[PDB]
Amino acid sequence: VPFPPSHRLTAKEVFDNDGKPRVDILKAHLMKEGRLEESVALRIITEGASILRQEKNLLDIDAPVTVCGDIHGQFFDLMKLFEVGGSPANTRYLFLGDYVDRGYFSIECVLYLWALKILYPKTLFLLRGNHECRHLTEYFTFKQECKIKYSERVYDACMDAFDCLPLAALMNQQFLCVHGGLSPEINTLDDIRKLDRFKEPPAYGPMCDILWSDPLEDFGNEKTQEHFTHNTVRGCSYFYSYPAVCEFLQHNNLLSILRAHEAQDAGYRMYRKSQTTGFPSLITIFSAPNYLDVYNNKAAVLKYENNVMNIRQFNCSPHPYWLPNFM
């Protein structure tokens, strides 16, 4: 088995004279289980937050981009994804959030994701997920990880940076990119713009729901026909039905809603399509293979370009074994 390099990469080692990061040098290092200097890591995080802070809650860009599902600090799975989806140097990617928690390599994902965003902030977009919070990071093994690998300094930095991440994005002003889904307190795009991103997600509300939003247990064979309902499964938020989403779309003249937050055995799942257009009203993307290291589910990413929706599927990747709570 390979051994992790004790030599930590320095700023001048990651960033060239032009101030541009060497994703090539970092990628190779990370692949060997290498870590960077506390100073460098803080620079990348802080540098990424500044850029995101300039972004709006709901970004609107008309261009071919590939949507990715939950990562769960699955760096080992993030490397393979880029291989199948293509190099980010000339390929536009879009994350739906959830880059930390679950995986014992959340730091590697955030660091690599942040560095890639600063290098190609016009081709790489990152959204905030229900996991992008402090309360959650404290409960999960994220906080402990940052303290075990680095310190509370890096953890706090990420938290403040995550608050700068976008909530949603309008791809081609037709598709809506989100983590959870629609919200009852949000029937228009303006409702989202009037939202506060620079802050922590509450246990409830519009911003929280969108991140915790989820389809009804029967987004198909429904008997009641309820639009919105309490999310008893997730233990919070609400649930949207086929008729509920179809109503919001028509009102907002949207094509489809691309998001994740829901694990899929095939890395993706298509929901009931519109009665008018032969397109799915909702779509779930999952880029986290072998969820919980138990399920043998596959991963995939949505690629929209030239009016073409290409779905790329991939299997899990090799990684070391880690005990629970780093026990």
Binding site: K298, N306, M309, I311, R312, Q313, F314, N315
Partner: peptide, 16 residues
């Protein structure tokens, strides 16, 4: 079927 264009690639290792 999907009105617009749509494609799909193959997996990395069929399971079932």
């Amino acid at each position: 079927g999907p009105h617009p264009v749509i494609v799909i690639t193959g997996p990395h290792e069929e399971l079932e």
